[PDB]
Amino acid sequence: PMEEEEVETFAFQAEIAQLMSLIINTFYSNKEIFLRELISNSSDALDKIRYESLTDPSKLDSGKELHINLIPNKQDRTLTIVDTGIGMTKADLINNLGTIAKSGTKAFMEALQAGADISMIGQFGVGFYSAYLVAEKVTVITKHNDDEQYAWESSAGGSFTVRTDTGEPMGRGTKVILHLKEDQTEYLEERRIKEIVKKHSQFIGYPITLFVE
Numbered sequence: 001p002m003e004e005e006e007v008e009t010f011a012f013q014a015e016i017a018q019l020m021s022l023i024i025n026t027f028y029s030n031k032e033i034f035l036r037e038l039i040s041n042s043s044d045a046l047d048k049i050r051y052e053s054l055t056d057p058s059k060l061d062s063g064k065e066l067h068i069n070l071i072p073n074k075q076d077r078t079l080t081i082v083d084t085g086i087g088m089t090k091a092d093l094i095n096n097l098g099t100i101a102k103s104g105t106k107a108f109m110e111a112l113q114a115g116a117d118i119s120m121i122g123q124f125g126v127g128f129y130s131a132y133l134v135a136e137k138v139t140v141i142t143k144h145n146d147d148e149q150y151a152w153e154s155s156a157g158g159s160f161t162v163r164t165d166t167g168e169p170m171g172r173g174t175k176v177i178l179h180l181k182e183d184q185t186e187y188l189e190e191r192r193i194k195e196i197v198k199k200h201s202q203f204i205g206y207p208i209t210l211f212v213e
């Protein structure tokens with residue numbers, strides 16, 4: 001029996017689209033900072049959870065462990081960033097991922113033309129898009145205590161899809177699945193991943209675990 005699934009196909013806000021192009025169709029060294037940004041988001045997601053969790057310890061029913069996991073798959077050619085953070089509700093997701101303007105967008109783009117490093121990205125509050133320095137496509141699976149599991153995805157081109165995730169359940173948190181461009185497979189090597197965590201992500205306040213096949 002054929003399953004059926006709803007997808008909503010959104011246009012990224014004009015400037016988030018401009019930024020995504022700029023990221024994709026421009027060469028930047030120091031791409032590795034994409035992980036730093038992704039670990040940061042999770043860190044922030046783990047704080048929101050832990051904080052709220054002292055008001056409602058029942059927000060931990062969905063998983064008490066507060067950590068980050070990195071899964072590089074040499075077969076899929078995916079680098080998966082998993083956290084047991086707070087997750088996003090649909091609206092958090094759509095505000096976080098594309099629809100709503102970001103007060104740092106224009107400024108960051110202006111900055112990049114002036115030759116700023118892609119590393120500056122986080123300060124402009126549009127850090128997640130660095131994901132696209134290395135991935136052709138990016139899949140975010142996410143789960144918020146209040147809501148259901150969502151699967152967001154974009155290969156860029158100006159649009160993203162959001163669909164309720166019928167798929168591996170997570171309980172709580174966000175999973176960023178990076179479908180690495182052909183030439184960015186270095187980010188599936190244990191050594192490289194360990195390198196960029198020690199380098200840019202040392203003071204994260206949660207255990208981070210690297211799983212290697």
Ligand SMILES: COc1ccccc1-c1cc(Cl)nc(N)n1
Nearest residue numbers: 041042045086087088096128174
């Ligand atoms: C796609 O992830 C994000 C993008 C922008 C801002 C925040 C996030 C985010 C939110 C949560 Cl709850 N977890 C994670 N890992 N990222």
